[PDB]
Amino acid sequence: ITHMLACLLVRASNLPSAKKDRRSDPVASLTFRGVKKRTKVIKNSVNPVWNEGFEWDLKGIPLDQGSELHVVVKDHETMGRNRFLGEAKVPLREVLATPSLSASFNAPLLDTKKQPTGASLVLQVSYT
């Protein structure tokens, strides 16, 4: 039998845009224990609804109180460097608390200096 960490990335809300006459093309990356996964790029939105699920094999290493999930949202640029919008570290401790094996988050997206951007991230996490 498999053991995995699962995340449903619902949506982000109230994303910032530095330049409003430039189309905003949000894309999110989720990293757990160094394994990075990405959503599709949503075009023309600052309130993107991905509704994408992600699974990480735990690889025989159990979750612990300190385990965390990192999500970054950027504004995609084809020529190349994507523009950083905001990020969150999601503490997974709550997932271990009850027999639900899960937790729900509505997390503020912060800039690299931890200043809240006004945007938020909606997601559910669970494990087996």
Those residues with Cβ within 8 angstroms of residue 122's Cβ, 6 or more apart along the chain or in another chain: 9, 10, 11, 12, 13, 105, 106, 107
The reply, when asked if residue 51 is annotated as ligand binding, is no
Q: Beta 68-75 vs 116-127: how paired, if at all?
A: unpaired
Query: Which of 102, 86, 107 minimizes the C-alpha distance to 28?
Result: 86
Those residues with Cβ within 8 angstroms of residue 113's Cβ, 6 or more apart along the chain or in another chain: none
Method: X-ray
Resolution of the coordinates in A?
1.8
Q: Which fold has domain 1-128?
A: Immunoglobulin-like (2.60.40)
Contact between 104 and 95 under an 8 Å Cβ cutoff? The reply is no
